[PDB]
Amino acid sequence: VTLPSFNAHSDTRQF
Amino acid sequence: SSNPHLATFAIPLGATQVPYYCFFKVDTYNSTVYKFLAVLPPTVREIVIT
Amino acid sequence: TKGELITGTPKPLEGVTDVSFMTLDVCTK
Numbered sequence: 001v002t003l004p005s006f007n008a009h010s011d012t013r014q015f
Numbered sequence: 016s017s018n019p020h021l022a023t024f025a026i027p028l029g030a031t032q033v034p035y036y037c038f039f040k041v042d043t044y045n046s047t048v049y050k051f052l053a054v055l056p057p058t059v060r061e062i063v064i065t
Numbered sequence: 066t067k068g069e070l071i072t073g074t075p076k077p078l079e080g081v082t083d084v085s086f087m088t089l090d091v092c093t094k
């Protein structure tokens with residue numbers, strides 16, 4: 001349980 | 016939604032339904048991105064900035 | 066370089082957050 005970071009879309013998780 | 020870069024974030028909803036992802040669009044003419052602030056809690060009573 | 070830090074995706078994935086899990090009322094790690 002942890003509210004994680006941004007989905008980080010575009011270090012961006014998504015790109 | 017959570018990707019303003021791809022999804023229009025013009026709010027289609029109100030009346031407190033579903034928590035809202037809240038970001039900060041960056042105001043600088045290079046990489047205007049949306050820094051993820053938080054998932055809006057259903058209730059906010061105190062906010063503070065410094 | 067391979068890793069889970071970044072993922073070149075055809076489409077970004079708005080909502081990637083929480084992704085948490087738990088077992089209430091259960092002896093659990």
Ligand SMILES: *[C@@H]1O[C@H](CO[C@@H]2O[C@@H](C)[C@@H](O)[C@@H](O)[C@@H]2O)[C@@H](O)[C@H](O)[C@H]1NC(C)=O
Nearest residue numbers: 016017025026027028029032033034036080
């Ligand atoms: C956010 O709220 C939306 C509610 O607005 C309604 O749906 C959109 C698509 C427009 O057609 C608008 O005119 C409607 O009144 C939901 O539709 C949407 O699914 C919600 N998004 C999430 C991620 O829950």
Ligand SMILES: *[C@@H]1O[C@H](CO)[C@@H](O)[C@H](O)[C@H]1NC(C)=O
Nearest residue numbers: 041042043044045046047048
């Ligand atoms: C944005 O950042 C880049 C990074 O090098 C810089 O070249 C550019 O001048 C910056 N522009 C603004 C408006 O901050």
